[PDB]
Structure 1
């Protein structure tokens, strides 16, 4: 539930990136497929 930090976690299965909900409306979600 962080305001502006984007998590990267890499385990033995794969590696995923979590984005907080509060950043999806911003310009940071254009790569992740949310956008303005």
Structure 2
């Protein structure tokens, strides 16, 4: 299985919250906020 190239995932539970970013989006403008721009 592989995640959708265009969708960023937020998930929250008892341990708190994480965001996970497709490696297809790192190196785009969308990666910059995660510290992984062009």
TM-score (norm 2): 0.87
**Which consecutive residues of structure 2, in runs of 5 or more, have no partner in the other structure?**
none
Q: Quick check: which one's strand share is greater? A: 2
**Which consecutive residues of structure 1, in runs of 5 or more, have no partner in the other structure?**
none
TM-score (norm 1): 0.91
User: Over aligned residue pairs, what C-alpha RMSD do you find?
Assistant: 0.6
Equivalenced residues, count:
36
